Amino acid sequence: RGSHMEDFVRQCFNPMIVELAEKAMKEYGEDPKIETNKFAAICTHLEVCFMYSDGGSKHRFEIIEGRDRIMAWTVVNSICNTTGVEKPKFLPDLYDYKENRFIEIGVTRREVHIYYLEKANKIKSEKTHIHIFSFTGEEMATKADYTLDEESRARIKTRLFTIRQEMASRSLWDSFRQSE
Ligand SMILES: O=C(NC1Cc2ccccc2C1)c1nc([C@@H]2CCCN2C(=O)CSc2ccccc2Cl)[nH]c(=O)c1O
Ligand SMILES: [Mn+2]
Ligand SMILES: [Mn+2]
Known part of the structure; x- marks a missing residue:
């Protein structure tokens, strides 16, 4: 059961983001293959977290999200x-x-x-x-x-x-938009 939203997430976000989102979802017992809208939300939130930490100086931010x-x-x-x-x-x-x-x-x-x-x-x-x-x-x-x-x-x-x-x-x- 492969959806369009899943393949779009894989193509839209970089592989390190997708991999961290995948491991995070299954760590909490949820499947990106079917919870595809949430899959997109985690990748999005993850990319914002990384962009945020890159907005400060060299070692200003410690990143918690994405970790085990x-x-x-x-x-x-x-x-x-x-x-x-x-x-x-x-x-x-x-x-x-x-x-x-x-x-x-x-x-x-x-x-x-x-x-x-x-x-x-x-x-x-x-x-x-x-x-x-x-x-x-x-x-x-x-x-x-x-x-x-x-x-x-x-x-x-x-x-x-x-x-x-x-x-x-x-x-x-x-x-x-209707899934949140
Ligand atoms: O850290 C969070 N959740 C833990 C627990 C958990 C569970 C699965 C996968 C990963 C994680 C890590 C977290 N959760 C949330 C949201 C609302 C509160 C509960 N919630 C979810 O469970 C939905 S998934 C999600 C949706 C949008 C953005 C980011 C995410 Cl992850 N919003 C954050 O901004 C946040 O940081
Ligand atoms: Mn958050
Ligand atoms: Mn978080």
């Missing part, structure tokens, strides 16, 4: 004991060595306001920073602190709208 869930925690306690930051209940996506906070990245196909609220009520941990990106170019960050400069964020927004267009050109966008 045990090692992703391992680096968190190391960070927590090193900087004295509260250990989050949820696994965050990044750590900003410059701002000394964990970051949760969000990528949404719906309204940016509502998704932040959902992510804020679920986190309930005031320490971690929250940064939401939309497939139409809206971004929302905790305390209106968007961490990176405009150029790095604009690059992420541009790629998101390219992913949207490519899905739409293949009639897969409507299914993707």
